[PDB]
Each structure stands twice: as structure tokens, then as C-alpha cells.
Design a protein around this nucleic acid. Structure first.
Ligand SMILES: Nc1ccn([C@@H]2O[C@H](COP(=O)(O)OP(=O)(O)OP(=O)(O)O)[C@@H](O)[C@H]2O)c(=O)n1
Ligand SMILES: Nc1ccn([C@@H]2O[C@H](COP(=O)(O)OP(=O)(O)OP(=O)(O)O)[C@@H](O)[C@H]2O)c(=O)n1
Ligand SMILES: [Cl-]
Ligand SMILES: [Cl-]
Ligand SMILES: [Cl-]
Ligand SMILES: [Cl-]
Ligand SMILES: [Cl-]
Ligand SMILES: [Cl-]
Ligand SMILES: [Mn+2]
Ligand SMILES: [Mn+2]
Ligand SMILES: [Mn+2]
Ligand SMILES: [Mn+2]
Ligand SMILES: [Mn+2]
Ligand SMILES: [Mn+2]
Ligand SMILES: [Mn+2]
Ligand code: NA
Ligand code: NA
Length: 326
DNA sequence: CCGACGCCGCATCAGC
DNA sequence: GCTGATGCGG
DNA sequence: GTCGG
């Protein structure tokens, strides 16, 4: 892409800060800079030019000047050669292993894929499954396959209870031609902000998808959020499709608009949008947008009858999902 | 300079 | 068992 | 690491 070298550098720095340094704000700062640069419609010729963009400061401007001059960043060359940093970074690529578990594993002499495989008993359930499908989870999902997965989820959901509505969100809803995984928002009239009238609303759906061998494993599961693994069925003599991550979030039906804005994202879009709301005197979560009282305490949920209504409250023009890929 | 940086679900642990 | 901190994830 | 105040 236009400034791909810079955004890659920044993304790598972000990862280092999160996984190694354990500095979440630095991680977020770097990702924010990469995101604003990614969107910038000119090929950046200097750090000064980049510094004009919001989120890009003095330190990043300097790194951009070094990157542009040399094609490299010394700081990253160093980090790349450091054994602890490199090991910690790799372990964190397994779902369920974060910065803390990675550093602990590397402490115990567990630091390669092979090491993990021969110490399964040191992993929790999530981590065990993340390792099992490590290779598959590296692969992206063509949109054509997302469409196939959408049909299966939507039709299977209908067979449990025709009152369910399932909406594929995440990168798919933002129009991506390929997705890292599948994200599904689920509703049912028996679960609203004002009561849960049926039990097992999410469970029933997971069971059904498992029953037809779509869902193959579970990373975690509660009453409103399921994290697992799924796989398209392959044809006769046809090689198997990769295993894919799937996230399903059951949302109170009357709070669909807040939930769908939330689950559509992107994650950076959300951080940016929620931060602006705070600046504007509001707080947005997946359920409500609420006013901030003077004390700084949230008040009553404001009326919402569209995604647009939420943008309006905070004085932002509506942005279609495809324009929320930050 | 500096205080804030999105907001919440589920798994695991420490403490009682 | 419960409750609140921490990890890791959406 | 950045930015408003
Ligand atoms: N998972 C879903 C999907 C949608 N709906 C209902 O369906 C309506 C709109 O249908 P749909 O086109 O599928 O969603 P949106 O286009 O995002 O909503 P709208 O066009 O009304 O703004 C929403 O008001 C919502 O009440 C729901 O309850 N649960
Ligand atoms: N830190 C995060 C992570 C995720 N999300 C929400 O959860 C959605 C799904 O998460 P994820 O699958 O990780 O993001 P995608 O945008 O779908 O990216 P990908 O193509 O890799 O799946 C995001 O889009 C966003 O709406 C969020 O609010 N904050
Ligand atoms: Cl930090
Ligand atoms: Cl480099
Ligand atoms: Cl360093
Ligand atoms: Cl859909
Ligand atoms: Cl709320
Ligand atoms: Cl769109
Ligand atoms: Mn992904
Ligand atoms: Mn996704
Ligand atoms: Mn996801
Ligand atoms: Mn597989
Ligand atoms: Mn703003
Ligand atoms: Mn996290
Ligand atoms: Mn400033
Ligand atoms: Na700037
Ligand atoms: Na991980």
C-alpha cells in the first residue's frame, strides 16, 4: 500500500510495546499513528509531513525520517535480534497466550512451537486449542468463504428458533474482501435490556452449530459471548478448508444499534469514536450511549433508533461500515 | 508539564 | 462457594 | 507516544 513500509514499522513497534514492554498505551499510540497514516492519501516524504496527522508525534516523525532515509529502523533491528523479545513476540501469536504467559513460558525454557507442543499440559484450555490450530489461524478467509459460512450460520440459527436474527459483523460487515475470522451478532426477542425470558439462548445456538459439525471447538463460552473454532464442510475428495475462529455475541434485542456499532468496529475506530464521545460528554458501550454528568458519572441511556443516532449525539457525520476500517 | 488514554465478557487465581 | 484483581480477548 | 489544556 501507499505508506506500507511505515505502517508496518509502526505496527511492529506497537507489538513490541504490547508483548514485550507491556506498555498498553504505547501499543495503542503506535496503532493509532499507523491507522491515521494508513488512511493518508499521499506517499509520505518526511517525518514533518507525517507529524501533521493527528496521533503522529515527534518521536514517530523521527522514526519515519530514519525509515525513509535508510529503509530500516535501528531500534527494530535490535529488537529483532534479541532472543527474549523475539521469543515473547512469537508465543503471543498463539490464541490465549498473552504478554504475561509468554514471558513466563520463556522463563521456563518454553520458547518455540515445538516447545509448546511437547508441553501441552502447561497450557490452559484456550491456549491448548490456540496451539492446535496455530497454523490454520494464520490463514485469512476469502469473502466467498465468509458468504458460505454466513449461509450456514444464518440458516442453522433459523432452525433453532425463527425469531433469532444473526448478523455477521467485524471486517465482513465493513466490506473486507478477506477476513481474519467470522464475527456474529445474535439477537432474540426473549432477551432484552429489561429481561431474559429464556435460558440457554446462546447455548442452544452453539449446540446446533456443533451438531452439524460447523463449530468444532470452544475457546470460551458464557451466557452472552462465545469464542470458538469452526470449519466449512469440504466436498467429496476435496481437501479440507482451514479451521477458522468464530466469535458470537448475543446482544439485548432492543440495544441492537449500539451492539452492531460495537461489533462492526474496527477496534481502532471504536477507540477513536468512544474517545471523541468522552470529549463530547458521552459514554458509549455495546448497550447504550449515556451522558456524562459533571461529576463524571454516567446518566440515563439516551434514545437510539439507528446507528446514525449515535454518531449524531457526538457530532460526527455518519460513516458507513466500509469507512470504519481503522 | 501532566493526566488521560474504550469499554466489557469469560477464565483463572488469590483471599476469605 | 463468593468476590475482586489480573490476563486476554471481543 | 500523543494531545488538549
Ligand atoms: N441481529 C439483528 C438484526 C437486526 N434486527 C432488527 O432488524 C432491524 C433492521 O434490520 P436490518 O436491515 O437487518 O439491520 P439494520 O440495517 O442495521 O437496521 P436498520 O436498517 O433498520 O437501520 C433493526 O431495527 C433491528 O430491530 C435485530 O433485532 N437483530
Ligand atoms: N479491542 C477490540 C477488539 C475487537 N473489537 C470489536 O470486535 C470486532 C471483531 O474483532 P476482530 O475479529 O478481532 O476484528 P475484525 O475487524 O473483524 O478483523 P479481522 O478481519 O482480523 O477478523 C471488531 O471489529 C470490533 O468491532 C473491539 O471493539 N475492540
Ligand atoms: Cl504504556
Ligand atoms: Cl526495520
Ligand atoms: Cl528498545
Ligand atoms: Cl449477515
Ligand atoms: Cl449500559
Ligand atoms: Cl459499508
Ligand atoms: Mn484477525
Ligand atoms: Mn473478525
Ligand atoms: Mn473476531
Ligand atoms: Mn485444520
Ligand atoms: Mn474529537
Ligand atoms: Mn487485550
Ligand atoms: Mn500539546
Ligand atoms: Na501530529
Ligand atoms: Na495471543
Amino acid at each position: 500500500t501507499l505508506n506500507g513500509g511505515i505502517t508496518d514499522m509502526l505496527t511492529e513497534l506497537a507489538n513490541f510495546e504490547k508483548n514485550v514492554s507491556q506498555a498498553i498505551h504505547k501499543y495503542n499510540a503506535y496503532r493509532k499513528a499507523a491507522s491515521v497514516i494508513a488512511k493518508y492519501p499521499h506517499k509520505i516524504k518526511s517525518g514533518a509531513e507525517a507529524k501533521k496527522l493527528p496521533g503522529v508525534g515527534t518521536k514517530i516523525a523521527e522514526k519515519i525520517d530514519e525509515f525513509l532515509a535508510t529503509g530500516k529502523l535501528r531500534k527494530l533491528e535490535k529488537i529483532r535480534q534479541d532472543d527474549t523479545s523475539s521469543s515473547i513476540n512469537f508465543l503471543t501469536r498463539v490464541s490465549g497466550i498473552g504478554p504475561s504467559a509468554a514471558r513466563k513460558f520463556v522463563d521456563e525454557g518454553i520458547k518455540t512451537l515445538e516447545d509448546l507442543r511437547k508441553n501441552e499440559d502447561k497450557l490452559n484450555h484456550h491456549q491448548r486449542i490456540g496451539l492446535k490450530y496455530f497454523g490454520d489461524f494464520e490463514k485469512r478467509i476469502p469473502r466467498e468463504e465468509m458468504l458460505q459460512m454466513q449461509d450456514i450460520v444464518l440458516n442453522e440459527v433459523k432452525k433453532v428458533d425463527s425469531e433469532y436474527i444473526a448478523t455477521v459483523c467485524g471486517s465482513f460487515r465493513r466490506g473486507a474482501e478477506s477476513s481474519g475470522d467470522m464475527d456474529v451478532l445474535l439477537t432474540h426477542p426473549s432477551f432484552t435490556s429489561e429481561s431474559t425470558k429464556q435460558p440457554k439462548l446462546l447455548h442452544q445456538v452453539v449446540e446446533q452449530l456443533q451438531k452439524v459439525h460447523f463449530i468444532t471447538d470452544t475457546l470460551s463460552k458464557g451466557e452472552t459471548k462465545f469464542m470458538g473454532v469452526c470449519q466449512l464442510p469440504s466436498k467429496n475428495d476435496e481437501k479440507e478448508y482451514p479451521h477458522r475462529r468464530i466469535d458470537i455475541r448475543l446482544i439485548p434485542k432492543d440495544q441492537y444499534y449500539c451492539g452492531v456499532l460495537y461489533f462492526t468496529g474496527s477496534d481502532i475506530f471504536n477507540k477513536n469514536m468512544r474517545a471523541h464521545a468522552l470529549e463530547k460528554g458521552f459514554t458509549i458501550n455495546e448497550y447504550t450511549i449515556r451522558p456524562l454528568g459533571v461529576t463524571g458519572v454516567a446518566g440515563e441511556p439516551l434514545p437510539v433508533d439507528s446507528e446514525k443516532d449515535i454518531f449524531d449525539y457526538i457530532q460526527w457525520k455518519y460513516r458507513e461500515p466500509k469507512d470504519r476500517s481503522e
